[PDB]
Amino acid sequence: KVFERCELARTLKRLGMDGYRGISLANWMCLAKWESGYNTRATNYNAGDRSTDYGIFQINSRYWCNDGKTPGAVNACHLSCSALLQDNIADAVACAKRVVRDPQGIRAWDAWRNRCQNRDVRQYVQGCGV
Known part of the structure; x- marks a missing residue:
């Protein structure tokens, strides 16, 4: 499933x-x-280490x-990677929460460091009612 912006914002909030x-939700x-x-x-x-990133959060195998x-x-996360390919993102969310429970928090994803850290991310949740 490919989410529309605000649709995902509310889904994540719920x-x-x-x-x-x-x-924050914007992050x-x-x-x-x-x-x-x-x-x-x-x-x-990832040919380099033979692992695969799965789903909406690209969680590594x-x-x-x-x-x-x-x-x-x-x-x-104690999940089959298949659970990270469902249209329903409950399991992926449970795993994303498990990831950030570690020391690094949201920084666990390099993409967050390069594209979200210290950036104006208001635009991601504006108008979504969240």
């Missing part, structure tokens, strides 16, 4: 993401936009979800 571990929106363009079936294979084919991998 899932308890606003202010989760101090992260989550900026992350999703740059990671997958709001596409829940987005995937990216080497550490967060299990896909069976990633060499020397763990599954911190």
Whole structure:
């Protein structure tokens, strides 16, 4: 499923993401936009370490979800990577929350550092009623 901007903003809010571990909805929106363009079936294979980034948040198979084919991998979110390819983003959100529970927080995603950190992200949630 490819979300419309405000549709995703409200969906994320209803899932308890606003202010989760101090992260605003606009930050989550900026992350999703740059990671997958709001596409829940987005995937990216990384030839370098043979891992795959899954879904709307591009969560990596080497550490967060299990896909069976990633060499020397763990599954911190305790989910099949398939769960990160559903139109319903509840499971992906549960995992994204697990990621930010770590020290780095939202900084766990490099894309957030390059495209959202210290940026004016108001535009991601303006007019969405969140």
